[PDB]
Amino acid sequence: QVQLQESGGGLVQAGGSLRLSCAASGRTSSLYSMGWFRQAPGKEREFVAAISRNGANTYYTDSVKGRFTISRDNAKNTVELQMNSLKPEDTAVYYCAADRFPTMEVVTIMTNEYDYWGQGTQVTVSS
């Protein structure tokens, strides 16, 4: 069906920066809203950032506003998470997700609505 392949993660010191990348392959024609989610051990998946199909609309969890930036390149079928000013709080396994709901401008913010999931990329921030 659809594979979401993630990269760009790893280990960095606090105040450091990374650029996560989710590459989609398969039937990318059915994908609309794209999003970034994260899970720290013990806790459960929290919404980080998401973007509409046209790229015009973005939504961020409060704690990452100003520090992380989400963009997409549909021609390359990729979405990026620009991560600046990383804090230890930001340590988690980061997942990209894709939504099938056929809408161009509306961004999906509900987690159970995302229909495809990446395997997950590890991000660790040392203080």
Add this chain to the structure above:
Amino acid sequence: SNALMIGRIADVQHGFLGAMTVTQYVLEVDKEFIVIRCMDQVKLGSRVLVQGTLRMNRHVDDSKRLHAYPFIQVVPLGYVKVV
């Protein structure tokens, strides 16, 4: 530009459109679909009667064809009614 349709709820989205939440539905008529935008209860699989403003919402793709991304707008006189 008023629309009125009846069909099954196929998909449900809880989304955002610039400082404002929005609930959207995929409405399956007969077989076709159209998105319903809202700026006993409406559920997945609900057979509903919908009335509202039909927006064509034509956009350019980066030829640069011009395609339609149509949806039904729903607000006092707009409604989604379970049946």
